[PDB]
């Protein structure tokens with residue numbers, strides 16, 4: 001066998017969601033992760049340098065800022 | 069014999085008068101027909117031909133009969149009344165000044181309002197040949213594609229550029245040069261025209277060398293007629309089929325518009341028409357039915373399901389969220405500003421366009437509520453123990469940045485006081501520390517596009533009233549313009 | 565330059581004045597030239613159609629050439645305000661009329677100013693300030 005299919009193996013995680021994304025080659029299942037280290041309100045993100053992302057990120061962020 | 073004549077003969081031809089060139093002509097000509105077609109003999113070999121077509125005397129007897137023209141423009145463009153009145157000025161003026169003068173015009177407006185077509189049509193009237201010359205990245209070519217030195221170049225896009233002046237400078241344009249062909253050239257009689265959107269990217273140098281005309285966009289009413297008397301027929305005829313083959317009832321045309329196009333131009337409109345012209349045909353060939361009538365119920369059976377939401381029939385009122393009318397390079401638009409409240413310090417961080425222009429305004433609607441507080445219903449101990457987040461979506465053009473004052477203000481309050489902006493209202497206006505509402509730019513396009521997305525009320529600066537005059541009948545008729553001078557006036561009408 | 569005759573179009577002095585007061589607030593005369601041409605243009609279209617050998621733009625005609633009024637030139641509409649002064653300033657492009665504003669919100673002696681970040685301004689600001697501090 002070459003790929004897995006389904007949840008006969010995987011098992012629930014923390015601060016880790018599976019988003020459906022539109023790849024040039026179809027639907028794909030990229031997983032976003034978040035990690036907590038002591039410090040300042042600053043948030044640094046990895047992967048695609050993304051200036052488009054920060055806007056969104058610091059918004060889901062700026063959401064939890066409120067309804068806490 | 070030898071091909072030593074095939075070319076040479078047609079060279080001394082009546083064509084090729086100017087001698088400044090003929091030098092370089094017979095020069096590289098009496099070259100090396102010796103020997104055969106060596107790797108060398110293929111080079112300059114061609115250099116001569118490009119040189120044979122370039123025009124030197126083929127002038128197109130410019131017919132300048134306004135009585136026509138002006139009403140040939142009314143054959144191939146619907147409205148644009150004011151824009152034509154100014155194309156003719158540019159001719160009645162032309163006729164006299166027998167030699168075309170420096171000021172050559174740019175057509176400016178959202179794409180799909182007809183800039184390109186007007187030009188083609190300017191030229192149809194002057195009976196000069198027409199050439200598009202795209203500047204998305206070379207006039208060299210130009211003439212060739214029209215082997216008649218009296219043309220109409222349309223410098224299509226001068227603003228998707230990363231200096232050329234030389235080509236237009238009234239003093240210099242006469243004598244024209246070009247590398248890889250170095251030799252002066254006369255462009256005296258050459259009607260130049262320019263298309264354009266964001267008048268910015270244009271070089272200050274150029275924008276002054278050129279006279280500007282703005283094409284505006286269109287009222288639902290206008291579009292509709294454009295569809296009926298030009299758009300549709302054109303698409304019928306182009307998808308080869310009869311007028312008797314397909315008709316769309318007015319109400320559906322309207323629907324196509326409100327629900328499948330939120331543009332200021334009519335390009336998206338044209339594309340959805342064709343969609344149908346197409347769907348239509350496949351019927352006419354199979355089913356053969358000589359007629360196809362698309363109606364306000366059929367529509368889905370042609371162009372898909374609805375695509376844009378039109379009206380607050382759908383939507384419910386929100387909090388700390390206002391809908392400001394902004395001036396996009398592509399028309400009136402309806403960008404929504406938002407504000408969020410998180411505990412902290414008086415600091416306020418805003419998102420979206422980095423905006424250094426915005427902060428000034430933001431921290432002014434802010435610095436307003438700072439003052440008139442209890443008077444407004446909001447815990448004065450706030451700028452001390454809250455942290456406010458604002459979002460101002462990109463789109464508004466530079467000049468119009470400060471036109472979002474009353475908007476952010478309204479939001480910031482509706483956000484602080486748990487109230488709620490009336491989904492129906494679109495607003496635009498500049499703010500000042502004291503709470504003053506200063507004058508705004510392009511109210512026309514703004515309310516135009518405010519109507520397009522179907523809002524009811526549109527709060528704007530008081531000192532803008534003399535601007536409502538020129539707002540087309542159709543749209544001024546579906547809007548209640550609340551005019552205001554201080555925030556409280558805006559706040560009272562935009563909150564509930 | 566719009567090829568036509570001096571005998572083709574004349575504007576009465578008062579109108580010229582009006583063109584200026586009401587369609588140009590510049591220190592140069594570029595805007596002025598543009599509005600002139602506006603008319604040189606409008607003029608011609610007549611001379612070709614109507615053919616009338618003359619066109620006389622007057623203080624009443626003006627709107628029928630260059631549009632409606634564009635700037636205010638007086639203190640008719642504008643009425644007196646509070647904590648808001650009109651200072652004459654020297655712009656790279658001539659005399660200008662920038663208005664300074666002041667707003668009062670509860671708090672501490674601190675004073676924060678907006679607009680030009682101005683380190684040059686604070687000195688002055690916190691001096692007119694430091695004046696009222698005294699003579700109260």
Ligand SMILES: Nc1ncnc2c1ncn2[C@@H]1O[C@H](COP(=O)(O)OP(=O)(O)O)[C@@H](O)[C@H]1O
Nearest residue numbers: 144145146147179180181182183184185298334
């Ligand atoms: N007023 C109008 N009358 C007729 N057709 C129009 C009009 N405005 C836009 N069109 C559509 O666009 C063409 C001219 O507009 P176009 O040149 O496409 O806009 P732009 O050049 O601004 O992209 C017409 O042939 C038709 O496709």
